[PDB]
Amino acid sequence: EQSWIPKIFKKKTCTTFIVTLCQCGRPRTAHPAVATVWDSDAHTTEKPTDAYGELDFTGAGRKHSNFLRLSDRTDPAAVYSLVTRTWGFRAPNLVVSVLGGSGGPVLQTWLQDLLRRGLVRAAQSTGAWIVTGGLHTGIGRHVGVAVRDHQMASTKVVAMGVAPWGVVRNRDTLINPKGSFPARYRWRGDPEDGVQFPLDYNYSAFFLVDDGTHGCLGGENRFRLRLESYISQQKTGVGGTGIDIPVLLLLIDGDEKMLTRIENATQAQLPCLLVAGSGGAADCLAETLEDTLAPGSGGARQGEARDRIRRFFPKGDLEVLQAQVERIMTRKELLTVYSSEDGSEEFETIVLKALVKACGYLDELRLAVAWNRVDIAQSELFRGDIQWRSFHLEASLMDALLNDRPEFVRLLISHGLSLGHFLTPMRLAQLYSAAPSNSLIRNLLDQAPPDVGHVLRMLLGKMAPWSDLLLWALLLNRAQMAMYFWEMGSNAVSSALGACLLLRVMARLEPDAEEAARRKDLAFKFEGMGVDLFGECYRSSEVRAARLLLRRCPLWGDATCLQLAMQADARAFFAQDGVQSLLTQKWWGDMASTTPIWALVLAFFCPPLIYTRLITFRRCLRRWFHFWGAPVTIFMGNVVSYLLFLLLFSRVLLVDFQPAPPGSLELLLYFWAFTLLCEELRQGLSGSLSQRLRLYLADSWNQCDLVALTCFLLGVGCRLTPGLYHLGRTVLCIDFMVFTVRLLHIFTVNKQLGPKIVIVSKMMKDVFFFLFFLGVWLVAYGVATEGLLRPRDSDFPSILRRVFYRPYLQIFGQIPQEDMDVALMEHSNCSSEPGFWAHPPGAQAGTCVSQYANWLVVLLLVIFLLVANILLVNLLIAMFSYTFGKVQGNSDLYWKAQRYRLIREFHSRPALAPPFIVISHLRLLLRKEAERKLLTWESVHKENFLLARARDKRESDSERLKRTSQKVDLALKQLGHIREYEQRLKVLER
Amino acid sequence: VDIAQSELFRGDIQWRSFHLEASLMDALLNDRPEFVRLLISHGLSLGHFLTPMRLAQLYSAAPSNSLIRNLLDQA
Amino acid sequence: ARARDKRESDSERLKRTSQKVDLALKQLGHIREYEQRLKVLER
Amino acid sequence: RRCLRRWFHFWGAPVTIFMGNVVSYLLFLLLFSRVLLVDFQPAPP
Ligand SMILES: [Ca+2]
């Protein structure tokens, strides 16, 4: 996408030649037919640019170095937009324009060290921009080599080149109005002249300013200054939240023209940093500022003396230099001197103080947040001399939140930053407004002032600053921010489970894919953290408090912790011992969890025994209801009722089922089945009508019960009709099978059998594989045998029998040799067809079979027996063994999870058994400070757990090794210092 | 390698395209990956570097009787 | 990413610490020699 | 025409070709079995 690039940007060709030789820098001969003082704009013609695209320096580089040619009189907004958007460069956190003449190809060692170590390092750390001449000469070359050395030794800095068109060596190769996306640049040009220079190969971007001249210097000064000012007017990301981008000018040596440029920059309110001892045109200003409030007598001509000394003799006589120095001092607040300090190389702090002084609201904390320098912020805060205001830190906190800098927010909060007063509906709206472009949260907010209530309602279903901040972070999916807020939350466990729920639902709702997977991962991390916190809260402290923690219903959604876990499928959460013990206790209701099963049975059959001490736990009726109200006793009663129901069903079906009108027992059976139907109706109805109906029908067991009951009704209806008695009997016969299959549910309660049942459920893929394999083989062998025999019955039912049924039973040791092996049969001439025939003795083995090639029949029999009885069955064994070995853990977790659903289901069933449950359905028809202390105790445990994790991490070997590396680096730094002092003392010895 | 990196990093020393081209050829022939990496990283023009003569030289460095050598001979 | 991960591995960090300690010992020998020279020049 | 384009897309998809081929193969086996077990006679085919 570049079609607009020629549109908004224009190159400059001079309209008029002004003297043989033009002022335009081109020979008189090479000029257009249109050819007192030449003007760079008045006598210039504009046309669409023809030298855009990107460079590919021959050899090294990132294979991408964007280049542009534009007129000097170009608005900077378009340039900034181009760089930020089209070329993909991130907005700058700081712009350092490195002025400087640097006379001579070689620069002093201390200056080169300062550049390479401070300037480039700080630029990389803070993601700043370096603006210099994009030429392999002057200060630009030094900057480029410094950047290259830093990149090599670091184990990518962004620097641009603003250079005049006409002085770029080999400009022709870059000319391509269509486009020069690839671009070969011969920067190793053998000829060397000062009229033109090659482009440095270390600069990521270029700005070949043009002013209709074939060579000159300084033409780009206007554009450079305007660009710097415009960048200074922008903001540091996060919409308008970002502070004004700091822009700083660094000056080393230079000339009078550099003094003029410094004056222009100061006029444009741009801070300037001067290096002491750099050389001419730079150290003079440093000295003058050092003079500052010098005495009027004997100082007025001191400035002139300094000008004539530091500056070159030319123009020294001219008073213009002194007047310009005075004008510069007029705004000395924007000037600073780089204290040499024997090569301090502490660039960032000097820049910070210079920016603060220039500002005279921009604050150190806001700048530190704008950059990623946590150390700067902590140093500034730790400085006791500096005093901070509530809003002073509030602005910084807002910036940190908007830009997602967890470390900064942590540090700011830790420094006594009031939070309750900090958050406001306006600020919260701002925070939510920072949704990244088209994110799912943004779509949800648009579809829905934050107005976050409705989005949460539509997410969950709906069927304290920390809480709000945590919710916002979860919505925006800022992992570290959310984790930190949770660490400061109040309802830690319930908060964690709610976060897991919300993240999982959002992820299933995201078009994010791998980004959604990170939300899924964040959900897993939160679930694990909640698990660990609860495990600590339970084992290490009173279990009663843990029980209270789970049962309570916080304000997250007015739902219990267990409900949240179940809705989020937080399988890991239920897997821990504490939750299982609590669930067991609820399962036994009021009676003790240790009650032996046999004791329970004896109590069940001997109601009076419940009052004996042999079972552990008006008082009498209260105890009675407790016993009969416990979920376990309801379960046992229901099982007994179900068994009696099956017994009655079997009795009726096998004996009393007659064509006559139904008897007493059959009617009792009908009433019983109707009771079961009412029970399932109750379960479905109360367990949003469509939503709960789907929830009920989802459970497989309920599907089984429903199919059983519908088949039962179908069969009864059929039997009542006079004609369909047999059909009714048959349907009821199958319905008995369907009912009795339900008894498998009894093994979902045991501590060992439930996992076995789940694993069996997962074996069905292997079962189907074997079934289809056997089906194919059966079809093959059966058809082959039947074809070879050629029985004369040729009756479709008989054909199907001999093709499938008999081969099938051959798998299970029913091998009728007398019906296939001719040797066991009497030879007879049954059929008129030519050949021989025999007479099988079997009733359904065919009237008579051929015997043409019977040895082949026996051979096929042997092959089939082998493949079926041995190979297929053993393959199935192996597949079962492998699958069972592979899915043990997942099955166990799944059972532990569903244990809660089971318990809840049985916790609300009517107290009575199905056969009498009609009476209970009828009844159903016709119809603090302690909490605060609990939360405080939970928060204390959370703090202990967090400290334990942090300390354990800090004591790990890897962290200790890293810290030792840091200390060794510090030791080497100090060793260099003492070595330098040693050299100084050795010198002073003489 | 350290000697080469020190020599290159020395700003006083100026290098020529062929000046590094000879070194690059030597590094390739002797199979010194670090040297070639460093040389290329130092703004060494590559498109102009390779030539059919140079490529023939490179392929001529097949070690004694190697399968590549047999295949080239057969071709 | 691969290069940085390798450089941040424990083994590489330990090797780099060994290099830095060797450099420290070199400089320590230098300063010790200068210490002896200064002690001599004291008289 | 959009209609024919959609039609060809459906019937051109590899999966649909696979399903069609499977159905054809099953019918072929069924025909084979029928012929072999019933209509296979010494008389001309
Ligand atoms: Ca049910």
PDB file of C-alpha atoms in Angstrom, chain A residues 770-924:
ATOM      1  CA  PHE A 770     -13.792 -54.171  17.019  1.00  0.00           C
ATOM      2  CA  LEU A 771     -17.467 -54.346  16.120  1.00  0.00           C
ATOM      3  CA  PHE A 772     -16.976 -52.976  12.625  1.00  0.00           C
ATOM      4  CA  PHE A 773     -13.918 -55.144  12.050  1.00  0.00           C
ATOM      5  CA  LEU A 774     -15.862 -58.227  13.083  1.00  0.00           C
ATOM      6  CA  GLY A 775     -18.809 -57.156  10.967  1.00  0.00           C
ATOM      7  CA  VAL A 776     -16.687 -56.892   7.848  1.00  0.00           C
ATOM      8  CA  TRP A 777     -15.033 -60.225   8.503  1.00  0.00           C
ATOM      9  CA  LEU A 778     -18.367 -61.901   9.219  1.00  0.00           C
ATOM     10  CA  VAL A 779     -19.877 -60.591   6.005  1.00  0.00           C
ATOM     11  CA  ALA A 780     -16.883 -61.867   4.073  1.00  0.00           C
ATOM     12  CA  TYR A 781     -16.736 -65.341   5.570  1.00  0.00           C
ATOM     13  CA  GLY A 782     -20.481 -65.861   5.653  1.00  0.00           C
ATOM     14  CA  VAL A 783     -21.001 -64.894   2.038  1.00  0.00           C
ATOM     15  CA  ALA A 784     -18.067 -67.025   0.933  1.00  0.00           C
ATOM     16  CA  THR A 785     -19.233 -70.106   2.821  1.00  0.00           C
ATOM     17  CA  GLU A 786     -22.813 -69.740   1.649  1.00  0.00           C
ATOM     18  CA  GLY A 787     -21.729 -69.304  -1.947  1.00  0.00           C
ATOM     19  CA  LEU A 788     -19.500 -72.359  -1.850  1.00  0.00           C
ATOM     20  CA  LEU A 789     -22.157 -74.563  -0.269  1.00  0.00           C
ATOM     21  CA  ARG A 790     -25.040 -73.468  -2.501  1.00  0.00           C
ATOM     22  CA  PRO A 791     -27.858 -74.679  -0.243  1.00  0.00           C
ATOM     23  CA  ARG A 792     -31.108 -75.306  -2.072  1.00  0.00           C
ATOM     24  CA  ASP A 793     -33.318 -73.448   0.413  1.00  0.00           C
ATOM     25  CA  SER A 794     -32.340 -70.080  -1.098  1.00  0.00           C
ATOM     26  CA  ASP A 795     -34.879 -68.456   1.216  1.00  0.00           C
ATOM     27  CA  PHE A 796     -33.995 -64.898   2.162  1.00  0.00           C
ATOM     28  CA  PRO A 797     -34.437 -65.401   5.926  1.00  0.00           C
ATOM     29  CA  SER A 798     -32.491 -68.642   5.669  1.00  0.00           C
ATOM     30  CA  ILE A 799     -29.817 -66.949   3.573  1.00  0.00           C
ATOM     31  CA  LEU A 800     -29.370 -64.220   6.158  1.00  0.00           C
ATOM     32  CA  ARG A 801     -29.274 -66.845   8.892  1.00  0.00           C
ATOM     33  CA  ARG A 802     -26.562 -68.956   7.299  1.00  0.00           C
ATOM     34  CA  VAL A 803     -24.637 -65.841   6.249  1.00  0.00           C
ATOM     35  CA  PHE A 804     -24.534 -63.993   9.583  1.00  0.00           C
ATOM     36  CA  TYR A 805     -26.056 -65.850  12.507  1.00  0.00           C
ATOM     37  CA  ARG A 806     -24.257 -69.173  12.195  1.00  0.00           C
ATOM     38  CA  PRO A 807     -20.831 -67.625  11.518  1.00  0.00           C
ATOM     39  CA  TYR A 808     -21.441 -65.359  14.478  1.00  0.00           C
ATOM     40  CA  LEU A 809     -22.113 -68.214  16.872  1.00  0.00           C
ATOM     41  CA  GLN A 810     -19.011 -69.918  15.530  1.00  0.00           C
ATOM     42  CA  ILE A 811     -17.117 -67.264  17.487  1.00  0.00           C
ATOM     43  CA  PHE A 812     -18.429 -68.639  20.794  1.00  0.00           C
ATOM     44  CA  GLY A 813     -17.678 -72.332  20.449  1.00  0.00           C
ATOM     45  CA  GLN A 814     -20.762 -73.289  18.428  1.00  0.00           C
ATOM     46  CA  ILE A 815     -19.125 -74.960  15.440  1.00  0.00           C
ATOM     47  CA  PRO A 816     -21.623 -77.160  13.557  1.00  0.00           C
ATOM     48  CA  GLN A 817     -19.206 -79.343  11.623  1.00  0.00           C
ATOM     49  CA  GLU A 818     -22.127 -81.528  10.553  1.00  0.00           C
ATOM     50  CA  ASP A 819     -23.518 -78.728   8.369  1.00  0.00           C
ATOM     51  CA  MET A 820     -20.375 -77.745   6.461  1.00  0.00           C
ATOM     52  CA  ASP A 821     -17.884 -80.621   6.351  1.00  0.00           C
ATOM     53  CA  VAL A 822     -19.128 -82.908   3.587  1.00  0.00           C
ATOM     54  CA  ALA A 823     -17.198 -85.803   5.109  1.00  0.00           C
ATOM     55  CA  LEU A 824     -19.781 -85.962   7.917  1.00  0.00           C
ATOM     56  CA  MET A 825     -22.782 -86.074   5.580  1.00  0.00           C
ATOM     57  CA  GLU A 826     -24.633 -88.723   3.601  1.00  0.00           C
ATOM     58  CA  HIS A 827     -24.207 -88.498  -0.152  1.00  0.00           C
ATOM     59  CA  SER A 828     -27.509 -88.097  -1.972  1.00  0.00           C
ATOM     60  CA  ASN A 829     -28.730 -86.953  -5.377  1.00  0.00           C
ATOM     61  CA  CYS A 830     -31.145 -84.318  -4.120  1.00  0.00           C
ATOM     62  CA  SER A 831     -30.684 -81.772  -6.905  1.00  0.00           C
ATOM     63  CA  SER A 832     -30.954 -82.261 -10.652  1.00  0.00           C
ATOM     64  CA  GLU A 833     -28.080 -79.861 -11.301  1.00  0.00           C
ATOM     65  CA  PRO A 834     -24.899 -81.623 -12.483  1.00  0.00           C
ATOM     66  CA  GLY A 835     -22.323 -82.455  -9.834  1.00  0.00           C
ATOM     67  CA  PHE A 836     -22.494 -84.076  -6.425  1.00  0.00           C
ATOM     68  CA  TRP A 837     -24.551 -83.173  -3.380  1.00  0.00           C
ATOM     69  CA  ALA A 838     -24.973 -84.136   0.253  1.00  0.00           C
ATOM     70  CA  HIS A 839     -27.715 -83.950   2.854  1.00  0.00           C
ATOM     71  CA  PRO A 840     -26.949 -81.983   6.035  1.00  0.00           C
ATOM     72  CA  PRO A 841     -28.697 -83.208   9.190  1.00  0.00           C
ATOM     73  CA  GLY A 842     -29.384 -79.721  10.523  1.00  0.00           C
ATOM     74  CA  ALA A 843     -32.880 -78.299  10.367  1.00  0.00           C
ATOM     75  CA  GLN A 844     -31.815 -74.849   9.122  1.00  0.00           C
ATOM     76  CA  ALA A 845     -28.607 -75.987   7.409  1.00  0.00           C
ATOM     77  CA  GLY A 846     -30.187 -76.225   3.961  1.00  0.00           C
ATOM     78  CA  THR A 847     -31.995 -79.155   2.387  1.00  0.00           C
ATOM     79  CA  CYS A 848     -28.819 -80.252   0.605  1.00  0.00           C
ATOM     80  CA  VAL A 849     -25.461 -78.639  -0.091  1.00  0.00           C
ATOM     81  CA  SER A 850     -22.945 -78.986  -2.867  1.00  0.00           C
ATOM     82  CA  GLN A 851     -19.680 -80.806  -2.320  1.00  0.00           C
ATOM     83  CA  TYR A 852     -17.689 -79.610  -5.313  1.00  0.00           C
ATOM     84  CA  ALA A 853     -14.795 -78.030  -3.405  1.00  0.00           C
ATOM     85  CA  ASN A 854     -15.567 -78.623   0.255  1.00  0.00           C
ATOM     86  CA  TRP A 855     -11.941 -78.719   1.358  1.00  0.00           C
ATOM     87  CA  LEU A 856     -11.997 -75.009   0.610  1.00  0.00           C
ATOM     88  CA  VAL A 857     -15.024 -74.621   2.870  1.00  0.00           C
ATOM     89  CA  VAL A 858     -13.137 -76.255   5.715  1.00  0.00           C
ATOM     90  CA  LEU A 859     -10.090 -74.117   4.986  1.00  0.00           C
ATOM     91  CA  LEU A 860     -12.206 -70.978   5.206  1.00  0.00           C
ATOM     92  CA  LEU A 861     -13.662 -72.301   8.443  1.00  0.00           C
ATOM     93  CA  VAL A 862     -10.169 -72.661   9.878  1.00  0.00           C
ATOM     94  CA  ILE A 863      -9.119 -69.213   8.704  1.00  0.00           C
ATOM     95  CA  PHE A 864     -12.219 -67.595  10.152  1.00  0.00           C
ATOM     96  CA  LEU A 865     -11.945 -69.387  13.470  1.00  0.00           C
ATOM     97  CA  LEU A 866      -8.367 -68.192  13.718  1.00  0.00           C
ATOM     98  CA  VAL A 867      -8.943 -64.572  12.756  1.00  0.00           C
ATOM     99  CA  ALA A 868     -12.067 -64.176  14.869  1.00  0.00           C
ATOM    100  CA  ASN A 869     -11.494 -66.184  18.033  1.00  0.00           C
ATOM    101  CA  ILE A 870      -7.788 -65.420  18.403  1.00  0.00           C
ATOM    102  CA  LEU A 871      -6.587 -62.355  16.552  1.00  0.00           C
ATOM    103  CA  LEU A 872      -9.576 -60.018  16.797  1.00  0.00           C
ATOM    104  CA  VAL A 873     -10.436 -60.861  20.393  1.00  0.00           C
ATOM    105  CA  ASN A 874      -6.829 -60.484  21.495  1.00  0.00           C
ATOM    106  CA  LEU A 875      -6.526 -57.203  19.622  1.00  0.00           C
ATOM    107  CA  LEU A 876      -9.576 -56.002  21.515  1.00  0.00           C
ATOM    108  CA  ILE A 877      -7.997 -57.103  24.791  1.00  0.00           C
ATOM    109  CA  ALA A 878      -4.873 -55.125  23.986  1.00  0.00           C
ATOM    110  CA  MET A 879      -6.817 -52.013  23.028  1.00  0.00           C
ATOM    111  CA  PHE A 880      -8.841 -52.202  26.235  1.00  0.00           C
ATOM    112  CA  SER A 881      -5.715 -52.622  28.333  1.00  0.00           C
ATOM    113  CA  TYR A 882      -4.030 -49.660  26.681  1.00  0.00           C
ATOM    114  CA  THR A 883      -7.048 -47.366  26.894  1.00  0.00           C
ATOM    115  CA  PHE A 884      -7.624 -48.291  30.527  1.00  0.00           C
ATOM    116  CA  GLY A 885      -4.001 -47.564  31.320  1.00  0.00           C
ATOM    117  CA  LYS A 886      -4.086 -44.243  29.513  1.00  0.00           C
ATOM    118  CA  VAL A 887      -7.259 -42.613  30.845  1.00  0.00           C
ATOM    119  CA  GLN A 888      -7.023 -43.522  34.533  1.00  0.00           C
ATOM    120  CA  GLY A 889      -6.215 -40.048  35.813  1.00  0.00           C
ATOM    121  CA  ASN A 890      -8.724 -38.115  33.741  1.00  0.00           C
ATOM    122  CA  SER A 891     -11.465 -40.569  34.632  1.00  0.00           C
ATOM    123  CA  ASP A 892     -10.676 -40.252  38.328  1.00  0.00           C
ATOM    124  CA  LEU A 893     -10.792 -36.464  38.162  1.00  0.00           C
ATOM    125  CA  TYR A 894     -14.024 -36.554  36.199  1.00  0.00           C
ATOM    126  CA  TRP A 895     -15.665 -38.777  38.782  1.00  0.00           C
ATOM    127  CA  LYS A 896     -14.478 -36.586  41.631  1.00  0.00           C
ATOM    128  CA  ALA A 897     -15.994 -33.619  39.824  1.00  0.00           C
ATOM    129  CA  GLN A 898     -19.357 -35.247  39.168  1.00  0.00           C
ATOM    130  CA  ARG A 899     -19.548 -36.341  42.791  1.00  0.00           C
ATOM    131  CA  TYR A 900     -20.826 -32.870  43.616  1.00  0.00           C
ATOM    132  CA  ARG A 901     -23.566 -33.019  40.998  1.00  0.00           C
ATOM    133  CA  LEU A 902     -24.669 -36.368  42.374  1.00  0.00           C
ATOM    134  CA  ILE A 903     -24.772 -35.080  45.940  1.00  0.00           C
ATOM    135  CA  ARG A 904     -26.697 -31.962  44.989  1.00  0.00           C
ATOM    136  CA  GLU A 905     -29.196 -33.996  42.998  1.00  0.00           C
ATOM    137  CA  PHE A 906     -29.893 -36.222  45.967  1.00  0.00           C
ATOM    138  CA  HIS A 907     -29.856 -33.327  48.431  1.00  0.00           C
ATOM    139  CA  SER A 908     -33.184 -31.971  47.176  1.00  0.00           C
ATOM    140  CA  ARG A 909     -35.177 -35.107  46.406  1.00  0.00           C
ATOM    141  CA  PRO A 910     -38.339 -35.712  48.444  1.00  0.00           C
ATOM    142  CA  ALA A 911     -37.695 -37.495  51.714  1.00  0.00           C
ATOM    143  CA  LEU A 912     -39.789 -40.521  50.701  1.00  0.00           C
ATOM    144  CA  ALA A 913     -39.369 -43.346  48.231  1.00  0.00           C
ATOM    145  CA  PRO A 914     -40.950 -43.439  44.761  1.00  0.00           C
ATOM    146  CA  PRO A 915     -43.899 -45.681  45.641  1.00  0.00           C
ATOM    147  CA  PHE A 916     -44.918 -43.232  48.356  1.00  0.00           C
ATOM    148  CA  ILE A 917     -43.237 -40.215  46.748  1.00  0.00           C
ATOM    149  CA  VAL A 918     -46.700 -39.254  45.514  1.00  0.00           C
ATOM    150  CA  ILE A 919     -47.560 -38.001  48.985  1.00  0.00           C
ATOM    151  CA  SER A 920     -44.434 -35.824  48.979  1.00  0.00           C
ATOM    152  CA  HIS A 921     -45.053 -34.449  45.492  1.00  0.00           C
ATOM    153  CA  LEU A 922     -48.516 -33.511  46.714  1.00  0.00           C
ATOM    154  CA  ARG A 923     -46.894 -31.552  49.537  1.00  0.00           C
ATOM    155  CA  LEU A 924     -44.604 -29.950  46.962  1.00  0.00           C
TER     156      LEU A 924
END
